[PDB]
Amino acid sequence: EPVQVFTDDLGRKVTVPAHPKRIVSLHDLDITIPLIELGVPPVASHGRTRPDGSHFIRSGALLTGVDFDNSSIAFIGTADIDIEAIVAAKPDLIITEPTRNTPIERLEKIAPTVSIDHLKGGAPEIYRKLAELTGTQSQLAILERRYQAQINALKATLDSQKITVSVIQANQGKINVMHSYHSLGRVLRDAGFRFPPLIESIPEGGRMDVSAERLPELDADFVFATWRGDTGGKPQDELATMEKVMPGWCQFLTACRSGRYVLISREEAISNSFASLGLMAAQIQSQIAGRPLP
């Protein structure tokens, strides 16, 4: 019953509960996982569909232990959001994002609705906004304190201001690089590691394709790449794709030639969650400083 006014990322000043009890989320990975971490899981959520017709919250169980099958969170649809399911969930707050296609004008006649945009400040701003929305600034501060401690533990392990890093990815015949590769890039930058010029010059929130011949320009002391394992995939498949991109690609990176090419599971690496930040920090730690080469 007590309310609050929130200005969303479309610039809409919306009257919302101070402490919402029945949140509806229109994205699993970008909204619902954060909501779970903050201790305000939604009563219904966008999710995904297996070939057998069963549903799952993407990265839910793996990163939070929470999924459709072990909770009372209702599934509202994958590509086509079921408006009736949203209404049947009796929300006091609906949370969507600009790359979701369900019209705001439809949603706002069900319940107070807000839209949040990761493009405006990334994951840190997403969680700040969600905490403000849900009255969970307190749970957020503890999540941020843990991340502070993981970053500091990493900085204390090695001189990161002296080690160069790089995150690359096979992209259909070329190499795609981001300015900051999601969880992996965020931890590497917050820890003070330095990227090659070609990556540094990419605008924040951007990405670019690089021709395979220009691999040496993406080299660093350590080169990270990620592999899709959600579908029965293994790290060797990512080694296969790179070989298709360029036969003997390894010889073009001193990091790969020297055995400082590191493969990280992609599902964990792409999530905006605090769970993932911790997994990235641990992996970066032992891989860079806990793996002496002969």
Add this chain to the structure above:
Amino acid sequence: EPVQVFTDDLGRKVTVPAHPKRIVSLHDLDITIPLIELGVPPVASHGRTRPDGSHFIRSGALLTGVDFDNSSIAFIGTADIDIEAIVAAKPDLIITEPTRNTPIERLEKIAPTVSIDHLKGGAPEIYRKLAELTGTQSQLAILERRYQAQINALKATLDSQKITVSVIQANQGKINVMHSYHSLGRVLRDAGFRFPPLIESIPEGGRMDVSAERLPELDADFVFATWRGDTGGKPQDELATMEKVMPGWCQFLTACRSGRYVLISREEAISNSFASLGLMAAQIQSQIAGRPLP
């Protein structure tokens, strides 16, 4: 004020809240960390003290984000428990353990008091007991679901019954080896890895010192060890410790000589927390299956 019966590990049937709101914890690592993970932080806790006079929950910030300096958990002592701070905290439940000073009989007249023993059943049992005690069985189920997903992700990454691992530790000129090294050994065992015959010979819950001449009997596809970092230590400090144990030790292990010797941060590795098991699984994954060697 609804009440339940709990038989503690001394065999005492104690009438305790069904849902305790104001828990006092007499041990940071064995009780407080579990309680925080179960979503029921204590209102007062044992912890450690620095020479400057500041107080902390060992592992609290690093693994949970929760500490004395960013919460309202009251510090109640390190060596000698502050009984007046426990009174001021108005507890409805006091949790103690057998390796503690405080007479159980003084605590009894402040609030219902139970004693939990880590020696019977370990962490799984500690967590099960606390969940029943605090009414947090559903939170535990969620933590367990995430552990299942992490083990499943690891097993799907590689054929683990095809790979041998070992965990060793320098111990004053000798090598100490456990049947299962805390969190790191539990994950390796749960994921289905094989161990060297000498390690499988050690009785469950046990450990053994061996001379460094016997290092080859601890050799594996991957040899793991841990380094203490909570106090400015670095991985290189543990390598220097090994060189004292035996000069040229690296050449004596095929794993080290070939670049399959991996160093893992100790504080996380020795914790019984669900957070640790997650950091272990992720590091084992990329270290074993995500690091191509030239």
